[PDB]
Symmetry: D3
Subunit: 159 residues, 6 copies
């Protein structure tokens, strides 16, 4: 339902998980956004000062929004739909072991799903959709949005 | 507790339910606001561009705020008390069948209740209050706030 | 899913609401069960000693099962599906004002819905079904299960 | 609402917290039950084989009933009201540091409160009641039920 | 914490998912139990009449225990720890597409995890444990409990 | 995780509890903030007009954010971590009896804990920490942050 009313959207990485190197996090997040900007007129920019539209946060258990994570495994992250303040923010469960590979939980893949929410997409019932609520590792090189993801995101922002 | 610190309050209809015609939704919502402005110094205006104080959204199940609706029937909608960002926003469960009549769930009647929350009112224990938590259809022509609703809303904004 | 594996089912009224006379409660509950036994091979009997299959309880707020009621209005009651121990038990929110008429919340009508759950039925999306999650008063003399209710209950116990 | 329909009630200690010696746990629990049997016709017996009415369990986080504890501090324990199966069972959050003294969280004091629930008592609004929802250490030698606790428990079992 | 006090444990399949053939369900469930009996003195038997210790149920959304499933994906099932009545029961989200292969959600693999709970095991933080809260398909022929699973289950029942 | 990106932070008292005199509330809150500014470079100012970073609200039960309080005792208050809109806001359960002394629930002590959250601190497992989730009255004259509180708050804002 909720949707951003602009094409230029900014994000800021609030804090970094110690599981990966800082540049690994920056890259994974940037690639995740690119997946969506590739099929829409949306443009994403990372900022280090000022208020960003989408704040990326790594935290475990109770972290300030009354929706605590559950420890290692299970729920991997969550994000608010489009909006001011908390809207669009993406939170990643620090109790997970984030990685750039097939071990632990892949940050890039999870970020794609979460940003889908940040942009206004809900869960899909299509097994192939990145918005399907069940995580399944796939190499980044072969990862691709499903037609369902494309349709949904374009129904909101076009292109 | 929370209360708006101004008399001019704006609202924007984020998206429309397919259950009714667009103008039916605009009218029902406008009439709902008028019910409250009629007994206070508050003034409501609908805007189509810019940030509105109260955003009206139609959505089903999980819709971005971590408080998912429950399908047809039961919870019909929910709204945040006065505040910035999400504050004041009213969400209507799309799984309900919204109408301008006695069938399905009447949008106008439900909107009056929700806006009551948007303005800072909680649930009432008075069976006659629009803020009573149990829905009961009443023709719009004979609908009226109860003394309890009036007292509560005026204790906040006067007039 | 859950279903009783017998036709003779007993119920016991744990405690009585002070809103009505004891015999009014006994009658309303008995009539509610009869609505279901009328369209199935099920037989219900009220017992005053021993362990009943379905325990009827009146309570407010937190009452021992970790699913507290919400005060006057809103959720009126809840019940567990078929099973031993807590299974089948029906709890009625004492914060409601129970009646034998159109005022407050009608016990008989609510009990029919709850017993539907006690017998293994979930919510229906049919507006006419007693299992539809939205309460609407109807005189007992004209009340009747919808075809959807009948089909569902008979798919479980036949007749 | 729920209430036991007998005077002879048995309890069994499912497992022991490593925080205290086994006999310290047995004693604290026995003293907690005695607090209630002292003002009612109820009689409690500890059994080591067979099905007990009240099962005492020490566990952390998610422990099998879908109502997970919250780690050290905060919620200290919880218990189901009178009934078969899970009814009456008392669960103590293992993440707390249980003791026989003023340090950590006193098992005896907490057990008195929990057993109050096991017997059918809800929370009290009386600051002096053991059933008041806020924990406050008091030496066992000077601990005593409040008039509110007495009235409530006797309204259920007399004496 | 909770644990069964016997070696002979029975289970009964309450209802069957239409996703698979009846015999496919019976087999998958039987194999899941065998995984646990292989490393303990426990013995499992399927019964078709009478009260089973562990009831297997397939259901979607709200199904009678006040802990509704969430639709396709996400939470796949849940189960109560050892105990009478509801204790030990395993519920499988019918909104998932259950299979005997790598498509949809594998019943056998999920059942192994759930039965782990039914037997008294909680979630593990070991990525290799079947009790780790994140689902990952693995061919049944190569599936195996992790040392962590073995230790945990044997700490409860030995062998 | 979330953290304020400035040293000058403002707060505004939305409404006052009738339990204490207005000046008692202002003082208790001011002292609570001072506890934190004493060990960091942070500076807090109370404003009466305009948008404050941290809004202090007194409310009971359901109060507009979908996380209702629980009546007298138990949960005493809650607050959102650093952020715009609702971020940082502190809500105090009006069902508690707030005081400047050892009776009821001490506002100052509770406010120190809540502001800890407002500033970005989560719960501590150190029994001596003000951020430990279990309330324990201590005279204001002898109250002091624990080393754990200091370390945590300084890891975020330094000094
Ligand atoms: C790359 N893809 C991802 C990545 C992440 C997620 C979700 C999974 N998840 C688990 C979950 C979701 C919903 C309910 C319970 C558990 C998360 O928390 C957040 O990320 C789902 C999917 C589908 S996929 O195409 O395989
Ligand atoms: C016109 N009036 C309305 C309209 C809407 C509502 C509420 C009912 N509701 C159901 C509910 C509320 C609380 C808890 C459970 C279910 C909603 O969700 C939102 O609207 C209540 C009432 C009382 S009334 O005077 O008859
Ligand atoms: C006679 N009929 C009843 C009686 C009772 C109920 C439900 C309503 N309800 C409110 C509710 C349900 C679900 C979610 C929020 C609120 C209850 O709690 C229990 O009873 C629903 C219906 C449909 S009806 O044909 O009009
Ligand atoms: C000896 N007494 C106890 C012991 C235990 C408890 C409760 C407190 N508690 C915290 C709680 C309760 C409710 C909500 C949040 C937190 C528990 O979990 C279980 O025990 C309350 C009280 C009141 S007292 O007279 O001081
Ligand atoms: C074969 N294995 C299974 C099978 C099932 C499950 C869980 C997963 N799950 C998702 C979940 C769990 C907890 C929280 C959110 C989502 C379930 O619901 C039930 O089954 C976990 C695991 C770990 S594994 O070794 O790969
Ligand atoms: C002065 N100190 C306070 C003040 C307030 C609080 C918390 C307690 N609490 C109860 C609670 C917390 C978490 C879960 C259940 C119950 C609150 O709600 C808010 O304030 C904790 C503590 C630890 S202390 O050093 O003794
Ligand atoms: Ca997790
Ligand atoms: Ca944002
Ligand atoms: Ca981590
Ligand atoms: Ca929330
Ligand atoms: Ca609904
Ligand atoms: Ca708003
Ligand atoms: Ca609709
Ligand atoms: Ca529950
Ligand atoms: Ca109610
Ligand atoms: Ca029962
Ligand atoms: Ca009543
Ligand atoms: Ca705890
Ligand atoms: Ca029991
Ligand atoms: Ca412990
Ligand atoms: Ca699911
Ligand atoms: Ca069972
Ligand atoms: Ca299915
Ligand atoms: Ca409280
Ligand atoms: Ca704020
Ligand atoms: Ca008060
Ligand atoms: Zn979060
Ligand atoms: Zn998601
Ligand atoms: Zn919403
Ligand atoms: Zn409402
Ligand atoms: Zn109940
Ligand atoms: Zn229902
Ligand atoms: Zn428990
Ligand atoms: Zn309690
Ligand atoms: Zn279930
Ligand atoms: Zn699990
Ligand atoms: Zn709040
Ligand atoms: Zn806290």
């Amino acid at each position: 339902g909720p949707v951003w009313r602009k094409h230029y959207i900014t994000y800021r990485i609030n804090n970094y998980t110690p599981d990966m190197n800082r540049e690994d996090v920056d890259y994974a997040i940037r690639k995740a956004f690119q997946v969506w900007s590739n099929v829409t007129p949306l443009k994403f920019s990372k900022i280090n000062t000022g208020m960003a539209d989408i704040l990326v946060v790594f935290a475990r258990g109770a972290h300030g929004d009354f929706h605590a994570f559950d420890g290692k495994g299970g729920i991997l992250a969550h994000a608010f739909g489009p909006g001011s303040g908390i809207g669009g923010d993406a939170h990643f469960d620090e109790d997970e072991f984030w990685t750039t590979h097939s071990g632990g939980t892949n940050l890039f893949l999870t970020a794609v799903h979460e940003i889908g929410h940040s942009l206004g997409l809900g869960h899909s019932s299509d097994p192939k959709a990145v918005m399907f609520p069940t995580y399944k590792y796939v190499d980044i090189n072969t990862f691709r949005l499903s037609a369902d993801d494309i349709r949904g995101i374009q129904s909101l922002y076009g292109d």
